[PDB]
């Protein structure tokens, strides 16, 4: 199961037109979240977005978002030390995907991005 | 591999006595790190340890340990809000394990705990 085929199916389930040329890093906008999909490392489908973090959130609160859960697609909050900004991402094997695999991954990623903006109050 | 079979092979490699009855959560002490191994969710082998972080590390420094890399066994640093302590963990599918898969996962987890310094 290649990246090309994976993206195709995903775009077919998003009511999106199958791109004639599938770039290495694909961008899909879900609401206000620009999500990027790519193969990294080879054999793994990685999805990531750049969230907005409340400057008033402590490290403990941010790290609490990364505790393991029963959903292996729950995204991880990290820092692009170099880029100087947060990176939220998830990941799964390209060889064990199901019809709804990629959609759920993208959905769990956005859901995680929304939770991060739900914390100030 | 069933959870029991994976644990048995790992313990043989670590030369550790295998309990008569294998519990769902299994611990192993490596150096100064107590590591816990369990199947969660079903079909996934989860390992985690409770590290001691450097109080000098800022928010950005701690979260930088979580960026994705080429090694899918690189551990994730998180926090248990109730216990009030950090939790470092990694995970991989039970259905795609090899002879040294769990040993490598444990090695990567401890290596990560050491990098937190």
Helices (H), chain A: 3-13, 59-63, 101-118
Using a CB-CB distance cutoff of 8 angstroms, which residues of chain B are in contact with residue A64? Answer: 78-81
Region of A32 (left: φ > 0; alpha: ψ -120 to 50; beta: rest) is alpha
DSSP chain A: --HHHHHHHHHHHTT----SS--SEEEEEETTEEEEEEE-STTEEEEEE-----TT--HHHHHGGGS--S-TT--EEEEETTTTEEEEEEEEEGGG--TTHHHHHHHHHHHHHHHHHH---
CA distance B47 to A17: 41
Are B77 and B86 spatial neighbours (Cβ–Cβ below 8 Å)? Answer: yes
**Cα torsion angle, A48, A54, A112, B64, sign:** positive
What is the rounded distance in angstroms from the CA atom of residue B18 to the CA atom of residue B22?
A: 8
Question: What is the C-alpha separation between A39 and B13, in angstroms, rounded?
Answer: 33
Calpha distance A94→A72 (Å, rounded): 14
Backbone angles phi, psi at B111, to 5 degrees: -60, -40
Smallest Cβ–Cβ distance between A78 and the set B67, B81, B89 belongs to B67
In this complex, do B79 and A67 lie within 8 Å of one another by their Cβ atoms? yes
List of domains in chain B: 1-117 (3.30.1460.10)
Whether B45 contacts B90, CB under 8 Å: no
Residues B65 and B101: their CA atoms lie apart, in Å, by: 22
Cα(A89)–Cα(A47) distance, integer angstroms: 6
Token pair for residue B7? Answer: 């644990």
Contacts of A63 in chain B (CB under 8 A): 62-63, 77-79, 86
The tokens of B74 are what?
Answer: 């690189």
Rounded to whole angstroms, what are the CA distances from B77 to A64, B48, B60, B62, B110?
9, 10, 12, 8, 12
Distance CA B112, CA A78 (A): 15
DSSP H helices in chain B: 3-13, 59-63, 101-115
């Amino acid at each position: 199961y290649s990246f090309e085929q994976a993206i195709t199916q995903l775009f077919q389930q998003l009511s999106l037109s199958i791109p004639d040329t599938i770039e290495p890093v694909i961008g899909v906008k879900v609401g206000e979240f620009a999500c990027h999909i790519t193969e990294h490392p080879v054999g793994q489908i990685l999805m990531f977005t750049l969230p907005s973090l409340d400057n008033n959130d402590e490290k403990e609160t941010l790290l609490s978002h990364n505790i393991f859960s029963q959903d292996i697609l729950k995204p991880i909050l990290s820092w692009d030390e170099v880029g100087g900004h947060p990176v939220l991402w998830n990941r799964q094997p390209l060889n064990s995907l199901d019809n709804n695999s990629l959609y759920t991954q993208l959905e769990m990623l956005v859901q995680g991005a929304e939770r991060l903006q739900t914390s100030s109050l």
